Symmetry: D2
Subunit: 392 residues, 4 copies
Amino acid sequence: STPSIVIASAARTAVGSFNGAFANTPAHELGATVISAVLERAGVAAGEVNEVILGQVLPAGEGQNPARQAAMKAGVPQEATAWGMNQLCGSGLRAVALGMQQIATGDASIIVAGGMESMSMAPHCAHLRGGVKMGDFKMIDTMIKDGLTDAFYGYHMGTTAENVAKQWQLSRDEQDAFAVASQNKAEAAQKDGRFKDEIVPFIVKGRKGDITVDADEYIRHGATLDSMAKLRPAFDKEGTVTAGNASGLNDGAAAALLMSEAEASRRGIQPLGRIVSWATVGVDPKVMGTGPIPASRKALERAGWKIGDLDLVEANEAFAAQACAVNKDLGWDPSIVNVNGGAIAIGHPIGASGARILNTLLFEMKRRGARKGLATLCIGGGMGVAMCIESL
Amino acid sequence: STPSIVIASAARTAVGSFNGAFANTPAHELGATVISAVLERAGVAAGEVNEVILGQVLPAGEGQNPARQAAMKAGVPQEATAWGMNQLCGSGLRAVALGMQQIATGDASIIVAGGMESMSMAPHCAHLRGGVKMGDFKMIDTMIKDGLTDAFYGYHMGTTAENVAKQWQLSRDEQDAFAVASQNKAEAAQKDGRFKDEIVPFIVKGRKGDITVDADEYIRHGATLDSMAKLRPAFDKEGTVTAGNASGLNDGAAAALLMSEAEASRRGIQPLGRIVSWATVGVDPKVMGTGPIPASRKALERAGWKIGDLDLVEANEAFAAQACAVNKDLGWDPSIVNVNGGAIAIGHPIGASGARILNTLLFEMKRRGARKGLATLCIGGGMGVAMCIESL
Amino acid sequence: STPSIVIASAARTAVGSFNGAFANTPAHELGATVISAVLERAGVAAGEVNEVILGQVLPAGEGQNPARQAAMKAGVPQEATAWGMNQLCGSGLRAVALGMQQIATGDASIIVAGGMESMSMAPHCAHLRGGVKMGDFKMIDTMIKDGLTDAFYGYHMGTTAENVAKQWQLSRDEQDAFAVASQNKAEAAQKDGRFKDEIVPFIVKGRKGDITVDADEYIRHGATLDSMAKLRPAFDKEGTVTAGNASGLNDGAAAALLMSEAEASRRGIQPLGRIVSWATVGVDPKVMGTGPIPASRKALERAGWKIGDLDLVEANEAFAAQACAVNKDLGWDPSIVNVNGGAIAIGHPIGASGARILNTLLFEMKRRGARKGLATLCIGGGMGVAMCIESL
Amino acid sequence: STPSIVIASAARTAVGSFNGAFANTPAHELGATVISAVLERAGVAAGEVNEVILGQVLPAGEGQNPARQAAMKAGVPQEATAWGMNQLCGSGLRAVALGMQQIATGDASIIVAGGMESMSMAPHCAHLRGGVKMGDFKMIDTMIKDGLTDAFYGYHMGTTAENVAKQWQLSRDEQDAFAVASQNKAEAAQKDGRFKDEIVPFIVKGRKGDITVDADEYIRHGATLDSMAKLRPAFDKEGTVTAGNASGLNDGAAAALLMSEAEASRRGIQPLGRIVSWATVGVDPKVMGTGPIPASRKALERAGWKIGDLDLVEANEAFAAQACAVNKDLGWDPSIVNVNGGAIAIGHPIGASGARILNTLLFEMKRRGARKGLATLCIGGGMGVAMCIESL
């Protein structure tokens, strides 16, 4: 026997700007909106879900197991189970793979999997148990410390982007021209409603009126080459990596309902793809941006695919330095990568990002009629992750 | 063939008291030591490890992916992978299930899985990005907030254990008799040397001298009934759960080394046991302590076992109310349950506990000649987790 | 020969709104600009200053003795001295009386006195030296706790205002009419340029552009009765005191340069006024708004003046309720009182407020040729302070 | 008529060690006990007090105007007034001069003046209103920032002491001997009972029992030269200033009751002394410890006294470096200086200090029948204060 698991349906919230639309929205509320979206999208009841798996890197102050909080809110019953996980920036795609294994091993019928992040709602913290007899103590930003800081080399993820830039000799112009392309592609898809299918509106409840967010607010309209070239380097003071050519700090969530291919056929569901293979591999944390290269190669090797059989790719844009590098090495046609733009434009809600690009990949595959696709992301601390999808 | 996954080796640190031995020791330092110890007792080099999965509930401020930090510090190379997960209190036993599924689906050969927790190091926090225009606020204790406060009703786990008491008509004398029986069992076994084999010593690097922690310090010697019956209830001013018949707040780590049964035989490794089956199930959050009941029935049914078949049990004592309710329903001989003691005496490092009680079961099964064996736990928010084990 | 002290020159900054124009300006920067202004307006050099005395209620986190920081920044020599003082709302006026006394006793020739306050920059705090063993604790708003809360009764100053409303039988209509009138009179004075003489502009230094602040930003233009009528009681849910008939939370500095009458004559300075008398008296904390009553009476008795001898009055408007009470009891003609509006409109930068209203008195006295003035304020904790000024 | 003000009576608490006897005692509680004491000692009823004046550098979080808190606790009537002031280390003496001035200008008859401080209770703070959009921020120790750091050069008072050691070429051995001598003189004086007359005991109310504190707890008994010599410099890795030859962080209060000489005679009071003169002068902040030189010289000139006229002197020991420079420059017989030890032994409760050493001077003057005395302190930010006292 050979299991065969499918992504029956999918949905992501809009990607919100740092301290923007979802500045005060807990992640699990966003998780709840995507959970109910994929349940109604597949025509599966919440009472049929066995388990819910959500990546999330910054859960501090949100209470017990936010994965359970989002399941219970979304109308999943208490007889189910739920948990979160953290492979950092790869978390939201990894969870989908972990959900695929629950079914493959005979321990679940129907999983909901993805990620959720509120980088806005991430707190400052300090270890205050001992007590402070004298002297300033630091209140630590958990978003910077737990999401953006290499634990081994002490510097920001964007410094790793400098390392990869200098390795591959990627000029400031090349990085900027990739950054403006991503903003133009993304603004172009948004106008044309190519993001409508995947986005489920989130309602931000308010004292003085409810608001419906259904649009990626981080996309810069009319992004220009000169606007990119005007900027100062954020990390290295004589470097190449600017705020324009790296992705942002963002809020959002994204998911996929998974079931066996036969169960989908029982119920008349038309899946957004079969999960044919997946893989995660580690590299040096100094150049974590190279993660997607070994990861995307192993995934393809597991599918029995060559790189030149693909039709579509989502390769996550943490930095125009590392995105450009991954693309150079693997050699896939750049006109099939980030067709609707990438993270530099859309945003980078860490734990949600992997389900985010997966959502974007599956819907464009349905839209253009691509059969073979791949989603991959670089990962802080030096990993990569990847997934090969085939359209039914 | 059948995916027949074994536990090649196992190791834990001793469990520390809150702000005690491991007071200022990062969880990942504690998890580093167990990853080396599992690799040593098996005879398996760190380079051969594909991935490290560690359950951990309270990572705030410890930096990017402490599972990865634990693995790198232990000498597992950059090429391997690592990630955290959180199903609260079952996390450590569910990571062993997850790592098993890696091997069963053929995505990995060798996994080190378990849990780690530093509850002493968990910080206080607040969301301060919007600022606080006027008026007092709370700096929140993330240990309480994210580790012990049920997200649904707003209260402590010691009130969910009170709901199990009023429902199952347990007395203030019935619980006081179970807590002293688990402190006497654990003091007995400790002075016997039955904990020796599972514990790997941890070195607490001081400045005015090192200290070697090689014994659980939450175990209290000479537990009387007067001290247990003289306390005031902590979670209800006229109630039955106290500090003495509830579990503690603790630090600790624990892990198993996993591979296929065929691979153990090639390497000349006599495995502690074979993982026959596992399961998790949800229950009403209000009465979370009854997770072990349906979870152990699911696990047992999957193995094709009766409750009678079992020769040794590890039912985690989060409380004396949840524990007695699980022992009475399932009706298994309590003379074989928590045979060297439970978490009232031993302690309760949230994320580690699942991996902690797996150690105790695996080393006692080896020693007393018990063929079959089940470990089980209750989980906050309303779930249960269980894993059946068979001897070679 | 009895010591005669004169106010040679005075100045204030504009009064900023809470987290408004001066949101991130330390009180001492504001004080430094007013110190430089009184010196320039009197023709006295910084080098001649013996002492600076600045009332200030909320200096936490600003560093050692902000009054010295203000004097040094203003170029007052290191050989001079400087100190801060605190009689709450009375501070800025009390400091002038204290300055007067340094010259009366022969200990100094030349004093700059007043006060300064940045309610905006006041921090949140907690006592964390003992160490917090477990659970949540409070970050205390120092502005509320140290500035606005009665230390004996534990309620806000606005609750003392409610006590005064009840005792003097002051309707919500009478309080709201008074409030609207203070806004309309301030708006009119502002429009006609009656605050220009007293205000020295303040340059808020910026990364991306300097902003000159020379207008009182808290004054509401076109304030309507209905806008006051619509508000909810802020302190007693069936009370009369609201946000609209109370003063606000504000930032500013204000000062006066003093010397003897004979000294002003040698220098050829035409002084703003002679300090004829001052007084300070306690009342019940519960009705602290009544402070001005005994304080003004005692100040007039010391001058040898009848209430009817006054040509102009500044009675500070902490709350409409108390301003009304004061005016009723004293019986002075209301048309000579706060002729250019009061603190309901202008603001109440606590430690500066007494020097703020003295500036307004002095510059209107000059403009209209009023010979006899009085400035008075109520004081949290139950006190009053009053000063009689006569024109030369 | 040249007003002649006497110190009718005086008192102080013992000086408490940092987080020691008065660890959770608010400063106004200490002040209340000394207010009661000066009244009882002088035979004056609380109802007769016109004003209370208390220096206090670190009032954050204690609530509105702690001077008023103290006065009201001590039964001083609501109709009196009270205020705090801040001239840093000079405060507690300056407040006495300012009290004298109330009486001298005919504004009051009876004043209670001194200082109070609880460095233990001083909180950590931060400005949080604008929010912290991203990145770490410090919780600031208000004791260090507002008490002990130079606001201009950003360094500790200890560095100014190093500046004075370098400038006066004061060896480590000379400073250490001075420090040892302060300890041994204070020990001898404590043992002989010489602090008993000045100290009023203070009841620390407990929950498991009340503790009466009537001994200065910071004084080290049996202090050795070797114990000073073994310390490492605390501020300059190659300096001379140490924990041992500097004063400490402390809690306490101290006060004097003032009235006219003619008033004491009416009441039949034998006063502790007549205030003959006072002075305050500025110096370079970099060498603030030199303050006492120009202040003492100025106070003596004012009194009409030569340095040689003095029979007793209290010169506050902030640091052995500056105490030594002061004594060298003035050249007064070091045998009449700090005859019962100084603040290196006794402690330095900032705002209370100047009234602390006034108390010790007055009670030793009475003891030995000394006719002419002077007290002086150096002040943070570069100032000096001094008062001349003559026995009746």
